[PDB]
Structures are given as structure tokens and as C-alpha cells.
């Protein structure tokens, strides 16, 4: 019996907005090699992960879970979380991925790394999809929280699903606020949640690529990044 379910839709929105992680910078630079680009990205991933954990603890209902359930959810979803975040801040930069304000890359630079251009294109496609849907920040934070609680929920229950319903209500409340009709409300809800299927797909491709990077053993991977990766096999 906990506090997340008692919140109103607006209290849910403000809590999520307030819990948002900061935009981190990359290293100030020289044209990218395979090892140099991957270094910057893995370094960035490690620092983003630290902020993600504290963000997760501020998502209503996440604190009520056992330590082990929190771990499972984050282990399953961390790359998904990173990706929807990357895709979100890349929205106003068509054809480009904004990894950091000083790291804006296009698909040609994704070809600096073998097997990266496909992941790049999928992310870019997702970003423009959000762009053409005019995704709002209040919708974004809802989708990201949904990914956190849902991605690992079928690999363990009731509390998590009740918090998920809570966010669906919040998402609908947001669309009702924007002036959308009932039909437009559930159509948009459907459109948004179907994106999560693609985001899952991207994360799975990305995880396989990170595994092969570990096997190549040229790009330095942190122990944290190594543990998050090994949880998926």
C-alpha cells in the first residue's frame, strides 16, 4: 500500500518532469575512428546510467518495489531508456542524433563503426516519427516510465501493473487536455505504445552489438556497462 496510486494526473506529470535527468556533455575534441567514437559513446552511456538510477528511484511506485525487482527492471530496460532519451532530444535535429550537445552525429558517421549504421537508421526513423506526431515532453516522460516498469514485468506483478494503468490514465489525461477527441485519444495512445515495440527491437540489436564489442575487446567497457550487458544472457 503506497503513494503512487493516490497521485492525480497532474501530480503524476509534475513528478515525472521533476525527476528528469540532465543533458550530459561529451568530451571536447579530430575526425572519428571506430575506437574513438565508441569510446565517447560508451563513456557517455556509463555517465547517463548513473543519472538513470536516481531518475528511476524518483518514478512513482518504483521505490515500493524490492531491491531485486528494481534491479531486474533496470537491467532489462536500461538501453531502451537510453534510446528513447537519445531519440527525444534528437527530435529538433532531423537526420541527426544528438548524443550530447557537443556530439551531434549523422548516419555517415555511424558507418565509422561496423554494424552501427543500421541502429543509427532505426533511431533516426524513431526520432522523425516522434517529430511527425509532435510528441510532447509530458508524453515522453510517461513513455519512458512505462518502458521502465513494463519491459521486465513478464520475466519475474500487481503493483507494477496498477502503476502502469496509472500512467495510461495520465497519458489519456494529457491528450484530453490538448483538445483531442475520444477517438483521437485512444488512437494516439495506440500509436505511441506501438513505438515501444520498435524501441524494444532497437535495444535488442544494440545489445547484440555491445556483446560483439566486448568480444572484439578493443573498446574499453566499464564494469557497470559490462554488468548491465551480461544481465541479458
Amino acid at each position: 500500500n503506497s503513494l503512487a496510486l493516490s497521485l492525480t494526473a497532474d501530480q503524476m506529470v509534475s513528478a515525472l518532469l521533476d525527476a528528469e535527468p540532465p543533458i550530459l556533455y561529451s568530451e571536447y575534441d579530430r575526425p572519428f575512428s571506430e575506437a574513438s567514437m565508441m569510446g565517447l559513446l560508451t563513456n557517455l552511456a556509463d555517465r547517463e546510467l548513473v543519472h538513470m538510477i536516481n531518475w528511476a528511484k524518483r518514478v512513482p511506485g518504483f521505490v515500493d518495489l524490492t531491491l531485486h525487482d528494481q534491479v531486474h527492471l533496470l537491467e532489462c530496460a536500461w538501453l531502451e531508456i537510453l534510446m528513447i532519451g537519445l531519440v527525444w532530444r534528437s527530435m529538433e535535429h532531423p537526420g541527426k542524433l544528438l548524443f550530447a550537445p557537443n556530439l551531434l552525429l549523422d548516419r555517415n558517421q555511424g558507418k565509422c563503426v561496423e554494424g552501427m549504421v543500421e541502429i543509427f537508421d532505426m533511431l533516426l526513423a524513431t526520432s522523425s516519427r516522434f517529430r511527425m506526431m509532435n510528441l510532447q515532453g509530458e508524453e515522453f516522460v510517461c513513455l519512458k516510465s512505462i518502458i521502465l516498469l513494463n519491459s521486465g514485468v513478464y520475466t519475474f506483478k500487481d503493483h507494477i501493473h496498477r502503476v502502469l494503468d496509472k500512467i495510461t490514465d495520465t497519458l489519456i489525461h494529457l491528450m484530453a487536455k490538448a483538445g483531442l477527441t475520444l477517438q483521437q485519444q485512444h488512437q494516439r495512445l495506440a500509436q505511441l505504445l506501438l513505438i515501444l515495440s520498435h524501441i524494444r527491437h532497437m535495444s535488442n540489436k544494440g545489445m547484440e552489438h555491445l556483446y560483439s564489442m566486448k568480444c572484439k575487446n578493443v573498446v574499453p567497457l566499464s564494469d557497470l556497462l559490462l554488468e548491465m550487458l551480461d544481465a541479458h544472457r
Partner: peptide
Amino acid sequence: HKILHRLLQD
């Protein structure tokens, strides 16, 4: 027994 445990507890 992992880094994630430490980060969540802190």
C-alpha cells in the same frame, strides 16, 4: 553482488 545494487541503495 553488483554495482547496480550500490547505485540503487545510494
